[PDB]
Design an enzyme around this catalytic site. Structure first.
Site, PDB file in Angstrom:
ATOM      1  N   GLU A  19       0.753  -1.088  -0.190  1.00  0.00           N
ATOM      2  CA  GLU A  19       0.092   0.055   0.041  1.00  0.00           C
ATOM      3  C   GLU A  19       0.802   1.138   0.150  1.00  0.00           C
ATOM      4  O   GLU A  19       2.019   1.227  -0.052  1.00  0.00           O
ATOM      5  CB  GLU A  19      -0.891   0.050   1.177  1.00  0.00           C
ATOM      6  CG  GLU A  19      -2.293  -0.219   1.013  1.00  0.00           C
ATOM      7  CD  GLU A  19      -2.991   0.906   0.716  1.00  0.00           C
ATOM      8  OE1 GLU A  19      -2.625   1.916  -0.122  1.00  0.00           O
ATOM      9  OE2 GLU A  19      -4.663   0.808   0.711  1.00  0.00           O
ATOM     10  N   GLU A  35       0.105  -5.472   6.167  1.00  0.00           N
ATOM     11  CA  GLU A  35      -0.062  -6.997   6.777  1.00  0.00           C
ATOM     12  C   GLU A  35       0.912  -7.856   7.390  1.00  0.00           C
ATOM     13  O   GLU A  35       0.760  -9.014   7.599  1.00  0.00           O
ATOM     14  CB  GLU A  35      -1.030  -7.482   5.794  1.00  0.00           C
ATOM     15  CG  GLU A  35      -2.240  -6.836   5.595  1.00  0.00           C
ATOM     16  CD  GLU A  35      -3.070  -7.599   4.507  1.00  0.00           C
ATOM     17  OE1 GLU A  35      -3.222  -8.904   4.353  1.00  0.00           O
ATOM     18  OE2 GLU A  35      -3.410  -6.914   3.332  1.00  0.00           O
ATOM     19  N   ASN A 118      -6.309   5.406   7.250  1.00  0.00           N
ATOM     20  CA  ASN A 118      -5.806   4.692   6.042  1.00  0.00           C
ATOM     21  C   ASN A 118      -5.079   5.399   4.951  1.00  0.00           C
ATOM     22  O   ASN A 118      -4.049   4.869   4.481  1.00  0.00           O
ATOM     23  CB  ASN A 118      -7.136   3.976   5.665  1.00  0.00           C
ATOM     24  CG  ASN A 118      -6.774   2.869   4.504  1.00  0.00           C
ATOM     25  OD1 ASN A 118      -6.288   3.252   3.462  1.00  0.00           O
ATOM     26  ND2 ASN A 118      -6.733   1.550   5.148  1.00  0.00           N
ATOM     27  N   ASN A 173     -11.884   5.332   2.692  1.00  0.00           N
ATOM     28  CA  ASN A 173     -10.501   4.850   2.380  1.00  0.00           C
ATOM     29  C   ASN A 173      -9.544   5.954   1.325  1.00  0.00           C
ATOM     30  O   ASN A 173      -8.876   6.507   2.155  1.00  0.00           O
ATOM     31  CB  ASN A 173     -10.945   3.716   1.430  1.00  0.00           C
ATOM     32  CG  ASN A 173      -9.680   2.459   1.444  1.00  0.00           C
ATOM     33  OD1 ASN A 173      -8.321   2.938   1.305  1.00  0.00           O
ATOM     34  ND2 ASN A 173      -9.901   1.500   1.140  1.00  0.00           N
ATOM     35  N   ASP A 227     -10.431   2.144  -3.386  1.00  0.00           N
ATOM     36  CA  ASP A 227      -9.255   2.108  -2.623  1.00  0.00           C
ATOM     37  C   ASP A 227      -8.423   3.481  -2.884  1.00  0.00           C
ATOM     38  O   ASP A 227      -9.188   4.375  -2.328  1.00  0.00           O
ATOM     39  CB  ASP A 227      -8.564   0.849  -2.975  1.00  0.00           C
ATOM     40  CG  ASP A 227      -7.538   0.638  -1.392  1.00  0.00           C
ATOM     41  OD1 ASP A 227      -7.246   1.559  -0.811  1.00  0.00           O
ATOM     42  OD2 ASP A 227      -7.311  -0.524  -1.352  1.00  0.00           O
ATOM     43  N   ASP A 230      -5.781   9.374  -7.328  1.00  0.00           N
ATOM     44  CA  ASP A 230      -5.126  10.296  -7.311  1.00  0.00           C
ATOM     45  C   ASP A 230      -5.259  10.882  -8.883  1.00  0.00           C
ATOM     46  O   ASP A 230      -6.044  10.433  -9.709  1.00  0.00           O
ATOM     47  CB  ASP A 230      -3.305   9.867  -7.658  1.00  0.00           C
ATOM     48  CG  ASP A 230      -2.788   9.968  -6.554  1.00  0.00           C
ATOM     49  OD1 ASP A 230      -2.555  11.001  -5.616  1.00  0.00           O
ATOM     50  OD2 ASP A 230      -1.785   9.085  -6.073  1.00  0.00           O
ATOM     51  N   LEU A 271      -2.075   3.651  -5.891  1.00  0.00           N
ATOM     52  CA  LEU A 271      -1.224   4.194  -6.761  1.00  0.00           C
ATOM     53  C   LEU A 271      -0.639   5.391  -6.679  1.00  0.00           C
ATOM     54  O   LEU A 271      -0.940   6.069  -5.870  1.00  0.00           O
ATOM     55  CB  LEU A 271      -2.081   4.269  -8.321  1.00  0.00           C
ATOM     56  CG  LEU A 271      -3.415   5.121  -8.007  1.00  0.00           C
ATOM     57  CD1 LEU A 271      -3.007   6.512  -8.624  1.00  0.00           C
ATOM     58  CD2 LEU A 271      -4.412   4.527  -9.328  1.00  0.00           C
ATOM     59  N   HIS A 272       0.294   5.739  -7.708  1.00  0.00           N
ATOM     60  CA  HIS A 272       1.092   7.004  -7.409  1.00  0.00           C
ATOM     61  C   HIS A 272       1.974   7.320  -8.898  1.00  0.00           C
ATOM     62  O   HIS A 272       2.412   6.384  -9.250  1.00  0.00           O
ATOM     63  CB  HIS A 272       2.186   7.034  -6.242  1.00  0.00           C
ATOM     64  CG  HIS A 272       2.350   8.159  -5.501  1.00  0.00           C
ATOM     65  ND1 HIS A 272       1.212   8.875  -4.976  1.00  0.00           N
ATOM     66  CD2 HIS A 272       3.410   9.284  -5.397  1.00  0.00           C
ATOM     67  CE1 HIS A 272       1.629  10.092  -4.390  1.00  0.00           C
ATOM     68  NE2 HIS A 272       2.713  10.275  -4.760  1.00  0.00           N
ATOM     69  N   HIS A 285      -3.075  -6.506  -4.003  1.00  0.00           N
ATOM     70  CA  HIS A 285      -3.285  -7.564  -3.237  1.00  0.00           C
ATOM     71  C   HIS A 285      -3.259  -9.041  -3.681  1.00  0.00           C
ATOM     72  O   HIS A 285      -3.441  -9.815  -2.761  1.00  0.00           O
ATOM     73  CB  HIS A 285      -4.136  -7.070  -2.079  1.00  0.00           C
ATOM     74  CG  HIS A 285      -3.775  -5.869  -1.248  1.00  0.00           C
ATOM     75  ND1 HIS A 285      -4.794  -5.078  -0.580  1.00  0.00           N
ATOM     76  CD2 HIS A 285      -2.786  -5.115  -1.481  1.00  0.00           C
ATOM     77  CE1 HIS A 285      -4.281  -4.041  -0.075  1.00  0.00           C
ATOM     78  NE2 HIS A 285      -2.992  -3.945  -0.579  1.00  0.00           N
TER      79      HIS A 285
HETATM   80 CA   LIG Z   1      -1.110   8.120  -4.508  1.00  0.00          CA
HETATM   81 CA   LIG Z   2      -6.148   2.215   1.517  1.00  0.00          CA
END
Ligand SMILES: [Ca+2]
Ligand SMILES: [Ca+2]
Length: 312
Positions: A19, A35, A118, A173, A227, A230, A271-272, A285
């Site tokens: 994440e 996790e 989160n 989220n 989730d 961006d 994402l980024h 995941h």
């Molecule tokens: Ca991001």
């Molecule tokens: Ca998240």
């Protein structure tokens, strides 16, 4: 709804709950592993990834008074090269690249105990908007708003105030801030995972939001939903739709997706964009790995890319 299938390239793998992908001011890449567990107890980690070899380095394993963290979302600061990390167990943390970290707050502005966080997003004024889908932070027993509506939204202002701006969310989220062309914060977009909804608020100032509205609808009847998210340079919002093998693309005005991006995995998480490029790094995941693909345009500049002492 048009669907595109770009080429996805594997970057690294074997990262439990992969994440919060983020790039710092030097261009280094970090992700979190919420996790990771030790003897059944949380032992989440924050890692730096070498983009050349894909090798991993754990720089921080957050723990407060014997309570391990569940780091899940990140944002890089502007005035200093440090990471703000939303932790489902510890709240909000500020982490230095050398691995040392600090707890930001145990209670909010109203004296109420902090909830586990989160994800988070800076607006161009330097305020940090945060989603809090978990219950109270450690030492309280761990709980999450997947079934009950007790998730909250916070705003950590530039003058250091932690203010709860809203609550009653069923697992808030992803979160993002829409800015006007002049750089002024305009709208706050919040993802409510299980309900398949994206909500928006008009930003009137620091920790001041009004006009809550259903902004967009996430496709599918699958378990999961929006989730991480961006914006790209044209204000298109890319949203990881956990469980349906796609990343949805919304236009500036929201509503229904204008396009979909098919992924070679069922669970895209976050994402980024790599600064100044069309390259998007995605965590998922299904295989607990990080991938990258080329988008149609550059990403929207993050707060850390803006200049404090700029002229224009
Ligand atoms: Ca991001
Ligand atoms: Ca998240």
């Amino acid at each position: 709804i048009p669907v595109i299938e770009p080429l996805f390239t594997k970057v690294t793998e074997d990262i439990p709950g992969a994440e919060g992908p983020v790039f710092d001011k030097n261009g280094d890449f970090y992700i979190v592993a919420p996790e990771v567990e030790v003897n059944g107890k949380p032992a989440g980690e924050i890692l730096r990834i070498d983009l050349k070899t894909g090798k991993k380095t754990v720089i921080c394993k957050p723990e407060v008074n014997g309570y391990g963290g569940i780091p899940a979302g990140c944002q890089c600061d502007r005035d200093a090269n440090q990471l703000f990390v939303a932790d489902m167990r510890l709240g909000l943390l500020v982490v230095q690249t050398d691995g040392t970290f600090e707890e930001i707050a145990k209670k909010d502005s109203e004296g109420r105990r902090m909830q586990g966080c989160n994800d988070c997003a800076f607006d161009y004024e330097g305020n940090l908007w945060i989603t809090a889908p978990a219950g109270e932070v450690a030492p309280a027993d761990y709980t999450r708003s997947m079934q009950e509506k007790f998730g909250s939204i916070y705003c950590f202002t530039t003058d250091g105030q932690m203010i709860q701006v809203d609550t009653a969310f069923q697992f808030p989220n992803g979160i993002a801030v829409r800015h006007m062309n002049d750089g002024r914060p305009y709208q706050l977009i919040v993802a409510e995972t299980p309900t398949k909804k994206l909500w928006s608020y008009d930003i009137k100032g620091p920790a001041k939001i009004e006009n809550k509205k259903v902004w967009g609808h996430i496709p599918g009847t699958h378990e999961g939903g929006a989730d991480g998210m961006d914006f790209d340079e044209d204000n298109n919002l890319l949203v990881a739709n956990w469980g349906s093998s796609h990343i949805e693309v919304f236009g500036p005005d929201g509503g229904q997706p204008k396009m979909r991006i098919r992924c070679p995995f069922e669970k895209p998480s976050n994402l980024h964009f790599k600064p100044q490029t069309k390259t998007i790094f995605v965590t998922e995941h299904e295989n607990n790995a990080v991938w990258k693909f080329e988008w149609q345009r550059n990403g929207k500049k993050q707060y850390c890319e803006t200049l404090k002492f700029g002229i224009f």
